[PDB]
Amino acid sequence: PLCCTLCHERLEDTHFVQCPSVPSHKFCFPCSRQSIKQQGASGEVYCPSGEKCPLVGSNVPWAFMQGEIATILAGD
């Protein structure tokens, strides 16, 4: 089933974050909000799995764009 990697909640009928390089890394907005809060205290916000997963095609961790952060932190 399509479920959040961190809290295991089913993702149907909700928005979620999809890691570009690891299809199974999917995160609900509540978990993504917590990850942004925790990570952004110290810099860029990488994959909420903690694994610093790369961009597809480049050897560098992907990170949330400012617009993605703003979308997620606005609330439901």
């Binding site: 979620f16 992907w62 949330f64």
Partner: peptide
């Protein structure tokens, strides 16, 4: 890249 938000 495309947005990560689905």
């Amino acid at each position: 890249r495309a947005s990560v938000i689905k």
